[PDB]
Amino acid sequence: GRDLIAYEVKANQRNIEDICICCGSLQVHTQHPLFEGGICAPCKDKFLDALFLYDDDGYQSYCSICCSGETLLICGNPDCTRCYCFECVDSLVGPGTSGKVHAMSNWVCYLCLPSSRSGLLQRRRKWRSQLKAFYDRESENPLEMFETVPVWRRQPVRVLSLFEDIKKELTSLGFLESGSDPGQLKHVVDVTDTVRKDVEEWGPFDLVYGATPPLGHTCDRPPSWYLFQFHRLLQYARPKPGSPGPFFWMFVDNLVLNKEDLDVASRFLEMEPVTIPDVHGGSLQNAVRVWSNIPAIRSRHWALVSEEELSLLAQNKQSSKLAAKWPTKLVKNCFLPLREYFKYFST
Ligand SMILES: [Zn+2]
Ligand SMILES: [Zn+2]
Ligand SMILES: [Zn+2]
């Protein structure tokens, strides 16, 4: 029970850290990352499971304290994507707060302002780092995981996109400034003769994107070309050892490389392809294979979509006179997590 926490602290005078501030249980597995308190094993596994999951509109999908996909109290600050529970607030803060909060116009989440006292709800100090320690420690197969970046420290993401110009997208998500001549994104198509100096020369990069061309046979160039090349230059673009900063990459196969090549591409990029489809009316409209080190990209995979189902989406995809414009809406959201590491401007 939740509502049983108040007494459990005001009365029994019991240390918060000994009770899962998430659900209420008293069998805490470890301590909550963002706020002072503990978290039962089961709630922890739910937390991990929703670590960088985002909603199309751009906000954090689940509740910042417990992970309740429903009761959502949004943060006023524009650089904040965090949301909170109705029950969470009232349970840990004070009864009747969620109403007060939902009542305001410009609210500022507890993780945004400094304050640490707010009823029983306290924001751990230097949490962005603690949240890393968490995932790193509690996950059962941790992956590359860069600590999150404070808002006043975030800087413009520098992009390098090969074969495809991810600019329109990145710009709409507010990752790329519009009224800017500098242009922190460099598109490049024929890298056939590019060299490490070239890349190093092209300014340093934060995110390296690549993608095989759709089914609109652009070049005689086999598909594997684009893979390998992306591979090659990816290395060139990598941060000079001793680099702390977050460096992300992501290569997209637009359903154009056969199994053989597909497997190779997975040995080189060193990960199995996270296939993300577009289902409309329970039917597979389009799909796209994807490799990346970006947070949560794997938790976007449809184990459901079979190979054969895909080999078929392809067969029918060639047999038609269509532009086959590249599948933007599919990947467009995989970048949302970066919002927590780089600077954002939609204003
Ligand atoms: Zn719990
Ligand atoms: Zn909650
Ligand atoms: Zn906030």
Tokens of 160: 């390098």
Shared-domain flag, residues 31 and 111 = yes
Distance, CA of 54 to CA of 61 (rounded, Å): 5
Shared-domain flag, residues 98 and 197 = no
CA 27 to ligand 1 centroid distance, Å? 8
Contact 5, 22 (CB under 8 A): no
Shared-domain flag, residues 333 and 185 = yes
Data resolution in angstroms: 3.3
Last residue of a domain, one of 143, 161, 185: 143
Q: Enumerate the β-bridge partners of residue 39.
A: 30
CA 39 to ligand 3 centroid distance, Å? 22
Query: For residue 266, what is the domain's CATH number?
Result: 3.40.50.150
Shared-domain flag, residues 151 and 132 = no
Shared-domain flag, residues 168 and 236 = yes
Ligand nearest to the CA of 78: 3
Closest CA to 83 of 50, 40, 46, 116: 50
Contact 124, 174 (CB under 8 A): no
Distance, CA of 326 to CA of 166 (rounded, Å): 10
Number of domains present in the structure of the chain: 2
CA 62 to ligand 2 centroid distance, Å? 8
- Domain interval for residue 137: 1-143
Shared-domain flag, residues 40 and 51 = yes
Those residues whose C-beta lies under 8 Å from the C-beta of residue 17, and which sit 6 or more positions away, are: 28, 31, 36, 37, 38
Tokens of 197: 């100096």
Shared-domain flag, residues 131 and 268 = no
Buried b (16+ CB within 10 A) or exposed e, 217-228: eeeeeebbebbe
Shared-domain flag, residues 59 and 208 = no
Which residues have a beta carbon within 5 Å of ligand 1, which is an ion? 20, 22-23, 25, 40, 43
CA 237 to ligand 3 centroid distance, Å? 33
Distance, CA of 95 to CA of 9 (rounded, Å): 15
Contact 213, 221 (CB under 8 A): no
Shared-domain flag, residues 133 and 274 = no
CA 37 to ligand 1 centroid distance, Å? 11
Experimental method: X-ray
Distance, CA of 312 to CA of 314 (rounded, Å): 5
Distance, CA of 190 to CA of 163 (rounded, Å): 7
Q: Report the first-to-last Cα separation within the chain, whole angstroms.
A: 43
Q: How many CB atoms lie within 10 A of CB 154?
A: 17
Last residue of a domain, one of 126, 143, 160: 143
